[PDB]
Amino acid sequence: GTECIAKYNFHGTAEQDLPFCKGDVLTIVAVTKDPNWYKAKNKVGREGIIPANYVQKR
């Protein structure tokens, strides 16, 4: 997985979203049908969909 850093706070929008905080380090675990959304995983192991825009590659 490729690590990312959250640029902003994200409160989910739907059941499948992965909420996170600015500064958080996430690992993109998969790409989705939509280019603006990725599936990632956080520190404690939770997974969900996040916006490609709120996150900074490496």
Structure description:
It is found in: Cytoplasm; Cell membrane. This is Tyrosine-protein kinase CSK. The chain has 58 residues and is an all-beta fold. It has strands at 2-6, 25-31, 37-41, 47-51, 55-57. It has a single domain (1-58), classed as SH3 Domains (SH3 type barrels, Roll). It has a five-stranded antiparallel β-sheet, with no helix packed on it. The radius of gyration is 10 Å and the shape is globular. The termini are close together.
Chart the SSEs and their pairings:
Elements: E1 2-6, E2 25-31, E3 37-41, E4 47-51, E5 55-57
Antiparallel strand pairs: 1-2, 1-5, 2-3, 3-4
Indicate the radius of gyration in whole angstroms: 10 Å
Q: Write down how many β-strands occur, each being a DSSP E stretch of 2 or more residues.
A: 5
CATH architecture: Roll
Q: What's the CATH C level? A: Mainly Beta
Encode the helix/strand succession as letters.
EEEEE
Q: What spatial order of strands do you see in the largest sheet?
A: 4-3-2-1-5
- CATH fold naming: SH3 type barrels
Share in β-strands = 35-45%
Number of domains: 1
The largest sheet, given as strand count, sense and whether it forms a barrel, is: 5 strands, antiparallel
Shape: globular
Structural class: mainly beta
Q: Which superfamily, in CATH terms, is the homologous superfamily?
A: SH3 Domains
Domain SH3: 1-58
Family: Belongs to the protein kinase superfamily. Tyr protein kinase family. CSK subfamily.
Protein name: Tyrosine-protein kinase CSK
Subcellular location: Cytoplasm; Cell membrane
